Structure 1
Amino acid sequence: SPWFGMDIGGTLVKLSYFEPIDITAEEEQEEVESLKSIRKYLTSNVAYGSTGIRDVHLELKDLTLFGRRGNLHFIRFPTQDLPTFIQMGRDKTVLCATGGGAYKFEKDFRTIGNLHLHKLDELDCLVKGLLYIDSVSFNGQAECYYFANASEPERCQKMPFNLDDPYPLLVVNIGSGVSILAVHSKDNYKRVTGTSLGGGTFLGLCSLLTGCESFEEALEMASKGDSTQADKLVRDIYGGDYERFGLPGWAVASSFGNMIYKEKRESVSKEDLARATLVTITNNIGSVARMCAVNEKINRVVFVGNFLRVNTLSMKLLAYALDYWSKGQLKALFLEHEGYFGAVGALLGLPNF
């Protein structure tokens, strides 16, 4: 069988696929046409159908996995289109799968004759996949990075971060919702808590407020907006800073709080609303992460999920906010393969079956 790892989330399906590159002459013979058609279809196309995408820049080249050399590919498509994926499977096998959809769609995967579905623990998969990718490196580059001098924009820059001893680690998984994990050892990790104000809140509220019809359009709108047109700031309430409690005048006192005034609702732009939605969600995630880090006594906070893909505004807001409000005690960390760790961890469960 082809070696596949799948994470079926509430919004996106993530697939990791290992393409062997050490196929012998005899191995290529014993290959069946449909397997050849699958490998060729996946490696010769970057878009699949109308909604599938291969993230080619993330590919790990010449990886040694399970005694074989190959390339590791990273592919995503909307969970809404999983019926098409399954129907293509039926028209053409151990599947290690995680995420909520591994349970919800179990019976659907079993409509593919003789398919064995192994549902794997979401937590085990995320941690194992994250530790594995960092261990193998991103084609010799660091998998993990931070934003250096996150407080000063003329200096702020992406820089590599070493995770050779990753413990302890607070993992903030920003998907549809948010899960916060504490990782103390390779064997000792737990889900601390979560928040329902996650990437699905950004996308859902932005769509209601602006009519945007994609994540990417929502980000494009937010990049042009001014969130202070919708938010009420400390200086709007006090006239300036509130130094008694260390609150700068620019801090948001009430998200969307200026929208209680009808004349302000009538003048705000869609772009302003999109940016306020992004700022509201991102700041709340940062604050929840900081509170959990203080309670777990962990100072490294790594953010994963796909809320942060092609989203440098939110990444830089997290980096600045965690450093500023922690007085420099906490560091925001990011990972190049942030959306795919569950899918990789699922793939890594293959030998136990």
Structure 2
Amino acid sequence: SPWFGMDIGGTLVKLSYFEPIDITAEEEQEEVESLKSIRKYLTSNVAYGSTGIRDVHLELKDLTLFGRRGNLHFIRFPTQDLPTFIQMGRDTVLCATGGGAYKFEKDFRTIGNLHLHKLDELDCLVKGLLYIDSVSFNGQAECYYFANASEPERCQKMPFNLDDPYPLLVVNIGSGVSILAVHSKDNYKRVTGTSLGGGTFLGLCSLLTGCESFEEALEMASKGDSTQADKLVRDIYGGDYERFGLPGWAVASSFGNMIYKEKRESVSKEDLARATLVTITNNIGSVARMCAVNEKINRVVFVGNFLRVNTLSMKLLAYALDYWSKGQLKALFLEHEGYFGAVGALLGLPNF
């Protein structure tokens, strides 16, 4: 069977596909035509239908997995379009994780003789993260941070070594947020979560601005000024509040200036998009900091797809975590941040 790992989230389905490249002359004859058309279709296209996308830049090449060499591909599409995916299949062992592995279990079994193996979301995320970092990103670091995140004339992306990754606080920003504490390869726990995640950003931004996509929401936010909607410390005090170490630029009340009708009438869509992004991102960073202090962990890695093509939130997290922790916490990021559950699911295949 084709080796696939699937993570069916509330918003996106993430798929990891291992394409063998050591196909002998005999193995190619023994392969069925449906298998050849599948492998050709996946490798000959970067867009699948109207909503499927292969993230070509993330591909791992010449990976040795399960005793074979191949390429590891990373594919995503909206969970809303899973019926189309299943219908394409109806006309194999599937290791699946995420909430949709349970919700859509009966749907996957409409594909005759298909064996669906639901795998623990926490196990898949941790095993997938540790595996990708162990094999590296084609010889480059999988993990990176923003060095000197306080000075913008110096803030630049730099590699970070996770060869001894324990302990680790994993902040998974999907539709919501889950916070995980990883103490060893076999000792990890879900600490807590918050409901203010990527779905909040996208849903609120759509209500406030009328944007029609995650990308359009980010483009609006890049042009906006969140201080037009937010009430800052200096709006309340007239300046910094030194007694409690609060700079004048710190947000005292997100959207707090929107209690005034005249300010609601002058704010732009871009301003509101930026204020939504800043509000959600700062809240995520603050919860991550509080959890790191309680878990006594100083390395905080952020995953999920809320940070995909989202350098604003990445740099805001790097700056905020460093600033508010007085330099005691480090914000870490991962190139394959959206796909670790799908990889971890694929890695559960030998158990069946």
Q: TM-score range with shorter-chain normalisation? A: over 0.9
Q: Distance in 1 between matches of 2:292 and 2:32?
A: 51
TM-score, normalised with respect to structure 1: 1.00
Q: Distance in 2 between matches of 1:325 and 1:190?
A: 25
Match of 2:268 in 1: 269
C-alpha deviations, 1:308-345, integer Å up to 9, x for none? 00000000000000000000000000000000000000
Q: Distance in 1 between matches of 2:254 and 2:122?
A: 32
- Give 1:231 deviation, angstroms: 0.1
Q: Distance in 1 between matches of 2:93 and 2:41?
A: 20
* SS of structure 2 residue aligned to 1:7: strand
Q: Distance in 2 between matches of 1:49 and 1:154?
A: 42
C-alpha deviations, 1:154-196, integer Å up to 9, x for none? 1000000000000000000000000000000000000000000
* SS of structure 2 residue aligned to 1:172: strand
Q: Distance in 2 between matches of 1:152 and 1:166?
A: 27
- Give 1:197 deviation, angstroms: 0.1
- Give 1:306 deviation, angstroms: 0.0
- Give 1:286 deviation, angstroms: 0.1
* SS of structure 1 residue aligned to 2:158: strand
Q: Distance in 1 between matches of 2:86 and 2:223?
A: 39
Q: Distance in 1 between matches of 2:22 and 2:312?
A: 41
- Give 1:23 deviation, angstroms: 0.1
Q: Distance in 2 between matches of 1:182 and 1:259?
A: 37
- Give 1:212 deviation, angstroms: 0.0
C-alpha deviations, 1:7-48, integer Å up to 9, x for none? 000000000000000000000000110000000000000000
- Give 1:283 deviation, angstroms: 0.1
- Give 1:68 deviation, angstroms: 0.1
* SS of structure 2 residue aligned to 1:184: strand
* SS of structure 1 residue aligned to 2:164: coil
- Give 1:202 deviation, angstroms: 0.1
- Give 1:259 deviation, angstroms: 0.1
Residues matched between the structures, number: 352
Q: Distance in 2 between matches of 1:136 and 1:345?
A: 14
- Give 1:151 deviation, angstroms: 0.5
- Give 1:126 deviation, angstroms: 0.1
Match of 1:314 in 2: 313
* SS of structure 1 residue aligned to 2:88: helix
C-alpha deviations, 1:243-296, integer Å up to 9, x for none? 000000000000000000000000000000000000000000000000000000
Q: Distance in 1 between matches of 2:291 and 2:225?
A: 30
- Give 1:346 deviation, angstroms: 0.0
Q: Distance in 1 between matches of 2:46 and 2:249?
A: 43
* SS of structure 1 residue aligned to 2:184: coil
Name segments (4+ residues, structure 1) moved above 6 Å. none
* SS of structure 2 residue aligned to 1:248: coil
* SS of structure 2 residue aligned to 1:42: helix
TM-score, normalised with respect to structure 2: 1.00
Q: Distance in 2 between matches of 1:206 and 1:47?
A: 26
Q: Distance in 2 between matches of 1:74 and 1:154?
A: 34
